[PDB]
């Protein structure tokens, strides 16, 4: 059960480093504003993990309950980590990264709760371009 | 998904499925005036059974 929930930790890990690194003045204006927009979701993840430990101090939270509460995070980090690595390997280190967001946005047309997260990022990161 | 194709195709003549899924499959090439006669087929394996064939023809 531990191994089943751990992929959200590695999913977070990869976007902390993405937000950190792609801030730097090499990478054009667009790659900054993408790394910028993503900070919001690290806050929300950090907020979540705070309250669960507060719960745990009361004794009122169990690993099976954690496996329930984590589920929106499991999806919403993986929708981001699988976007970061596509900008690393793609080296879309210019206006071309908007193509990767527009394609990924259209791909999630079926998925609503995942589609808004992707529509947010392209609505944000396109502003400098 | 299937209405997100249809409710666009009913107003604006464009389609974008990668792994094929919508029923009004355009064939490639034949971009000349012959487009009107030939270009848009009607994929019989993929009309969604909550609509009739006639309907899939009206939207085509």
């Amino acid at each position: 059960l531990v191994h089943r929930i751990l992929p959200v930790a590695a999913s977070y890990s990869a976007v902390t480093r993405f937000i950190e690194e792609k801030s730097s003045f090499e990478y054009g204006q667009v790659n900054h504003a993408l790394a910028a927009a993503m900070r919001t979701l690290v806050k929300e993840h950090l907020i979540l993990v705070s309250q669960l430990e507060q719960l745990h101090r009361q004794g009122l939270l169990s690993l099976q309950k954690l496996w329930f509460y984590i589920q929106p995070a499991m999806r919403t980090m993986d929708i981001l980590a699988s976007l970061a690595t596509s900008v690393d390997k793609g080296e879309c280190l210019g206006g071309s990264t908007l193509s990767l967001l527009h394609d990924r946005s259209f791909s999630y047309t079926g998925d609503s709760q995942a589609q808004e997260l992707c529509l947010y990022l392209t609505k944000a990161a396109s502003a400098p371009y | 998904p299937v209405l997100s194709f249809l409710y666009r195709w009913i107003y604006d003549g464009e389609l974008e499925d990668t792994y094929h899924e919508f029923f009004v499959a355009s064939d490639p090439t034949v971009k000349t005036d012959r487009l009107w006669h030939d270009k848009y087929t009607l994929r019989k394996s993929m009309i969604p059974s909550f609509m009739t064939m006639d309907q899939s023809r009206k939207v085509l």
């Binding site: 309950k65 496996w67 329930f68 589920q71 791909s107 079926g110 | 998904p1 990668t18 792994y19």
Partner: protein, 43 residues
């Protein structure tokens, strides 16, 4: 149902209809985990 939705959330080829379907399966399956926590609660 888990092994099915894994082998269909892996590989992109399954299409938009495939995605919305496994999204519905994840959502309707999500409550079954809630119930299992309500059970896990008992001593």
């Amino acid at each position: 149902i888990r092994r099915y939705t894994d082998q269909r959330s892996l590989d992109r080829s399954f299409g938009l209809v495939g995605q919305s379907f496994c999204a519905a399966l994840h959502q309707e399956l999500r409550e079954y985990y809630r119930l299992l926590s309500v059970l896990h609660s008992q001593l």
